[PDB]
Structures are given as structure tokens and as C-alpha cells.
Amino acid sequence: VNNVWNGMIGEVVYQRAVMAVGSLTINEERSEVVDFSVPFVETGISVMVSASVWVMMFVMLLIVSAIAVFVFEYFSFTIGKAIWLLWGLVFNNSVPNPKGTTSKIMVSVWAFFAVIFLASYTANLAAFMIQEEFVDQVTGLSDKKFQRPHDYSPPFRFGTVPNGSTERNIRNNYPYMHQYMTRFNQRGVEDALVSLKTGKLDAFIYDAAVLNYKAGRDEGCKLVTIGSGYIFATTGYGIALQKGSPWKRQIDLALLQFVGDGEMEELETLWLTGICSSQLDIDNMAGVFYMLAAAMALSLITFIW
Amino acid sequence: SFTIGKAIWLLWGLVFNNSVPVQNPKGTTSKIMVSVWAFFAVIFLASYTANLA
Amino acid sequence: STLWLLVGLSVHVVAVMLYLLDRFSPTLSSAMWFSWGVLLNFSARILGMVWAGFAMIIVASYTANLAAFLVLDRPEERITGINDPRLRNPSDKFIYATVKQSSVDIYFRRQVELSTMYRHMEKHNYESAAEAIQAVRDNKLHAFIWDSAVLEFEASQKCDLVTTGELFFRSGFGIGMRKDSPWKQNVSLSILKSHENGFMEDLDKTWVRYQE
Amino acid sequence: TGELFFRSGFGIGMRKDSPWKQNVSLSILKSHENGFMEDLDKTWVRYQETLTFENMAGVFMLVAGGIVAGIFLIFIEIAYK
Amino acid sequence: GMMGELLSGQADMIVAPLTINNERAQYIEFSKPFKYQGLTILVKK
Numbered sequence A: 001v002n003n004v005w006n007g008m009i010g011e012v013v014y015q016r017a018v019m020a021v022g023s024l025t026i027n028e029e030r031s032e033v034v035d036f037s038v039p040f041v042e043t044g045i046s047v048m049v050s051a052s053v054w055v056m057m058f059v060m061l062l063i064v065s066a067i068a069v070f071v072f073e074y075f076s077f078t079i080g081k082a083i084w085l086l087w088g089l090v091f092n093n094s095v096p097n098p099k100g101t102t103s104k105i106m107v108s109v110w111a112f113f114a115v116i117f118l119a120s121y122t123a124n125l126a127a128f129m130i131q132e133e134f135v136d137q138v139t140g141l142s143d144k145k146f147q148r149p150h151d152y153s154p155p156f157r158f159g160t161v162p163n164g165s166t167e168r169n170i171r172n173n174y175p176y177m178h179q180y181m182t183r184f185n186q187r188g189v190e191d192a193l194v195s196l197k198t199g200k201l202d203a204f205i206y207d208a209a210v211l212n213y214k215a216g217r218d219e220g221c222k223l224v225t226i227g228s229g230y231i232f233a234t235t236g237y238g239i240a241l242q243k244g245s246p247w248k249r250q251i252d253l254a255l256l257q258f259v260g261d262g263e264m265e266e267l268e269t270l271w272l273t274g275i276c277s278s279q280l281d282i283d284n285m286a287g288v289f290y291m292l293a294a295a296m297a298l299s300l301i302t303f304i305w
Numbered sequence B: 001s002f003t004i005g006k007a008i009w010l011l012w013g014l015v016f017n018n019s020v021p022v023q024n025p026k027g028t029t030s031k032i033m034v035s036v037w038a039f040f041a042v043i044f045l046a047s048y049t050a051n052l053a
Numbered sequence C: 001s002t003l004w005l006l007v008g009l010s011v012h013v014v015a016v017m018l019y020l021l022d023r024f025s026p027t028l029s030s031a032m033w034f035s036w037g038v039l040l041n042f043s044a045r046i047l048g049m050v051w052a053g054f055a056m057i058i059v060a061s062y063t064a065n066l067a068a069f070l071v072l073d074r075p076e077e078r079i080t081g082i083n084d085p086r087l088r089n090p091s092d093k094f095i096y097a098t099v100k101q102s103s104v105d106i107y108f109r110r111q112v113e114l115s116t117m118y119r120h121m122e123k124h125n126y127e128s129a130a131e132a133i134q135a136v137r138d139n140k141l142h143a144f145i146w147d148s149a150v151l152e153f154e155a156s157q158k159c160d161l162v163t164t165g166e167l168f169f170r171s172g173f174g175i176g177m178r179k180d181s182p183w184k185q186n187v188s189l190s191i192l193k194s195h196e197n198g199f200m201e202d203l204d205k206t207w208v209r210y211q212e
Numbered sequence D: 001t002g003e004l005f006f007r008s009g010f011g012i013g014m015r016k017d018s019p020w021k022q023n024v025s026l027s028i029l030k031s032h033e034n035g036f037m038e039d040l041d042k043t044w045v046r047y048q049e050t051l052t053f054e055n056m057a058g059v060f061m062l063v064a065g066g067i068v069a070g071i072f073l074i075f076i077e078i079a080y081k
Numbered sequence E: 001g002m003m004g005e006l007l008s009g010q011a012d013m014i015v016a017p018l019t020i021n022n023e024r025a026q027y028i029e030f031s032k033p034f035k036y037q038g039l040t041i042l043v044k045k
């Protein structure tokens, strides 16, 4: 503020302290006024929000129909209804009777094939049930929706806490984003999180380690970040020092020594807990609706004839 | 015509639901009861498969 | 479920449209009973068979989702020992208690790293283990920490209760004495001999191993 | 596989105390904080380059062979009659 | 290797995927990272 610093950088530059232990990113202006040690935890900035099978079956069904026609030629009303009977017996619906030996053998073999196919379909259903996915609305800071919310049909809201490295970087990178963002400058992480629940706000832009921890220890697991994260300005945390301080070399070597033998991993496990239903068939029901719409369209087409 | 003593075979076959030709149903109450019992047999075999798993 | 009612409405609509198609095609109760026999198990026959295939796929999907509902999403009423973060950071929901002024209290107080648990438990410490078991049986408690032998015997006696998996702070039971006393060496040797032969096995069979 | 252990970085090595150190580090930071590393990742690294036929291909082939055998048996029966 | 070449005077700068660790950092001065990563295992499937 007018060539005046404040906070931890303010206390370090003006010789009221020798180092600043707390969480503190690395960027150009701070590296110009002080000296940072090697990073020991990486934090960027991220976003927090709340075909031929049928053809071959048809070919085999045509083969079955031709076999049934041959059986009828050799030795009653199942000429054009052979396909109807076969596909009715596929699902074992007991629709209101084969007589020829070859026809019975073919029907039995195709029934066994339908049984193994339905077993495979049950296995596929089990695999689909095992598979679980989340939904991500925003792809990145340069997403199409983020381009201009007013242009988009819903004027969704997204904000960050001001007076930070994140705000400074967004200002330097994209002015229009900052212009729109100014309206929702919600202060504090804890106060910020609540508006996300209530829906007054839609997206949240902050560090990555903080958001990872706050998603990890959230009760109910409602809020989820987007993809891996660190989607920009991938930076780390440092220990600030005065310019030319003789502690820099020793502190760098000690931090590297700690990182190189798993002690940092032990600390991360101890102090950061990263964890990780109901029936739904929306896609299946939509597909069934499309198929029945096609069927009724076909019936209407055949209505004239 | 003969479902007085031969209904046991029909019911037992429809317990397993193997589409075995047993007898052609005619009574409405019998058909509804057989359909409900077939649904019960289907859910029972589903529970048996879950028990096997 | 609600989806089941929606499917019922859909099959009723399909039956109605099949009846209309039958009327338009150049009888009533027969078609109704055919729909009754099909939905549960020549233009309209194609629609009927396709809808039968839909019904088979729907019952298969319902079987799969009910199997998932009965297998996977099972509440974890257990705690799996001290390594539960829900007990690392407690609340007013999970109430785990112990007997006031016993070995467990000393063990938890000695380790400073369990200061959160030590502060949490001090509100619910009970006078006796019988009272604690009675309170948890009256659905007042959620967890209880005590010796393995007593808890296993109580679980065998009363089948409604179940123990957890983790086993920590393994120790033994001793016979206290004064300080240096004449009755020490002989008592210890008697205990060792009783272990090596079959007497402790007999005692465990008669008092602890038996099942009610 | 899954696990990711011994997380470290990549550096541009130099001599010991050398006049080209602080400027190189500041240039790396300035390239990080804007989109240059993203452009490089796009061009070089980020750029990217059931079936029901596993346990049923042999089954289908054997079924076709059995169908051919049944056709031959039908021909044999026709010749017999 | 590259570190021996750099120390012996045959080169002035190493531009390559060089990892940062204690043994190397004791003798040469790295810059700040331009790529964050770890280690993993490759299998054939």
C-alpha cells in the first residue's frame, strides 16, 4: 500500500523479525523484497464448487428365420412369425410352440445364448454400479462460463477473499474476471464456505492445500474441488528471510534432508486426512423413453398401411 | 380342465420360472395369484443369488 | 419405490395405447388380461415384445440395484479401534466412555497426544462397568473401552452386543503383594507350573470358554 | 500404478555462486505465474494421443462350428431318408 | 555424468530434467522448480 508492506512480509522487511514461519506462497514481488527457502508443500490455485453387437444379433436372427423357413419347406403359421417367437422366447415372457426337431434345437441353443447374454448383462450392471463419478461444472479459470457470466443464461456468482496473492495474480492476468469478481468479495474462509452451502454463491477461488483439507474434513461430503487442481500459478510454501541472511543455506539443506527420508510424508499423514449409495437410473429411463418414442413413431408410420 | 390335482406341478414349475409348459391358465384370480407368486419367486431367487455372493 | 410407481404409470400408458391400436386396427377383456399376463409374466405384438424386453431389463436393473443396496451401502456401526478420525475429533453424537479412575484412565492421561480424547471422556466416566454396560444396553452410550476377556464374555452372554477389531495396549493380570515379601518366589513358580500343565486350560474351559 | 512417493522438482543447475542465478530464478517464477508453462504443457505433454468379445469370441466360433456340424448332420439324415 | 562435467568446467549451465536433492545441493546451486512430480511404477497391461 503506497510502498508500505504489512503482515509477515512487513515484519520481516523492516527488521522486526528474522523469519516468517507461517503459510506463505512464492511470487515475484515477495522474492524481490525478501529471500525464500525451498518449497516444502505445493499449492497452486483451484476452484471449489458444490454397435455391431446388435447388427450381428440381427444377422444371426435372419439366419434363424431362414432355417425356420427351410424347416417349413421340408415339413405351421411360424413362417413370418419365426422372428416374433424367437425374440419372445429371448425374454422368456411365455407369450401365447415349436414342433420340429431342428427348430426346437435351434430355439434351445438360442435360449442358452440369451441366458449367457443376460448373465453378462447382470455383470455389466454390477460393473456400472461399482463405477461412480462426480460432476464438474467449471473446467478452469478460463472456462466458457467464467468468460462472461452475464453473457451466459444464468448470472452465477464466484468470489475470493481480497488482499491476497490469489487476488493479485487474477488482477494481473485477467482484468474482466476481477471486475466481475469484485461484487462478491466475501471475507474469511469460514464465512465464505457458508454462502456456498446456501447458494448465494456458486464458486470459490483460493489456495489448493487449504481447499483439499477443508474438503477432506467436511461432514457429509458435499463440496468437491475440480479434477486434480493446481490448475494455475503452481507454487509452494516458503520460509521468508531477510536479504543476505546467513541462515539460508543451512535451512535449505535441512529442509531437503527432511524431505528426502519420508518425515514430511509422516507429517502430512498425521496432520492432513484425505478420505476417498442411492438408486438412480435417469440415463436408462431417458434411453427407454427415446426407444419408446421411436417405437410409437414407427407405429404411426405403419398406421397408414 | 384338469387343474384340480395338476396345479401343484404348475405352481412348482413357476416357482423356478423355467418356462416349462404345464397348463394354460384361464381363471383371473388364479392368473393374478400366479403372477404375484412368480414375482415373489423372482425376488427370492435374487436374494438367493445375493446370499451366494 | 417412486421409480416403481412411475414404471407402473408408464406400463399403464403402454397398455392404453396398445388397446387403442387394437381398436384402430381393422377383444377388450382379452387384451386387458393379456396385458396383465405380460406386464408381470400383429402390429401390437411387436410393441408387446419390445415392452417385454424393457420389463426384463427393468427387473434386471432392479435386482442389481437392490443387491447393491443390501451389500455395499451398509452402515459402519463399528469403530475399528482408536484409528477412527470420528473419535480423533469427537462431537456430541459418538459417546465413548470408560470406568472412572482405572487403568484405562491412567493410560489415556499419560499420552499427551490423546489430550482431546482425555478431555472428551471426563464428562461420561462411570462408577462401574456394570453400570456402563447397562447404559450402553439402554442405548445411552455408543462405545465402551475395557478389558478383552470381560467384553468377550459379555458379548457371548448377550448376543445383541458386538466387539470391534483393533487390539491395543496388550498387558497381563498379576497378583499384587507388599514390597519384598517371603511369598513372592514360590507364588511366581506356582503360577508358572500351573501354566505349563493343564490347570489354566481347565479353568478357562469351565468359566470362560463355555457358551451359554 | 497408483502410489506416488518422493515428490521433488526439476531445476536448472548452475555453478556455485554465479552472476546468472537470481535472474534465472525470477524468470522461472514469472513464467510460472502467467500461462507460459501451461502453453508448453499443452504443446508437449498435455497433448493426448462392454466390448463383449473376450470370453465369447471362441464360444461364438465353436457355436458356428457346431451349427455347421448340425447342417452336415441334417444333410446326412436327408440322404438316409 | 552431467554433474561431473559441470563441476570440471566443461559446461556452464545444465538444462535437463535434473532432480533436486541433498547430495547435489551441497555442491551446486539449483534454481526454483519448473516442474513438480514424484515417482511411480510402470507395468504392462
Ligand SMILES: *[C@@H]1O[C@H](CO)[C@@H](O)[C@H](O)[C@H]1NC(C)=O
Binding pocket: A001, A006, A162, A163, A185
Ligand atoms: C483489505 O481489504 C479491504 C476490503 O476490500 C480493504 O478496504 C483494505 O484496504 C485492504 N487492505 C490491504 C492492506 O490490502
Ligand SMILES: *[C@@H]1O[C@H](CO)[C@@H](O)[C@H](O)[C@H]1NC(C)=O
Binding pocket: C182, C185, C186, C189
Ligand atoms: C517356598 O518358600 C520357602 C520359604 O518360605 C522356601 O524354603 C522353599 O524353598 C520355597 N519353595 C520353592 C522355592 O520351591
Ligand SMILES: *[C@@H]1O[C@H](CO)[C@@H](O)[C@H](O)[C@H]1NC(C)=O
Binding pocket: D022, D023
Ligand atoms: C538480476 O536481477 C537483479 C535484481 O537485484 C538486477 O540488479 C540485475 O541487473 C539482474 N541481472 C542482470 C544481468 O541485469
Ligand SMILES: N[C@@H](CCC(=O)O)C(=O)O
Binding pocket: A023, A024, A025, A161, A162, A163, A164, A165, A166, A167, A206, A207
Ligand atoms: N496463503 C496465501 C493465501 C492467498 C489468498 O488468501 O488469496 C497467501 O498468503 O498469499
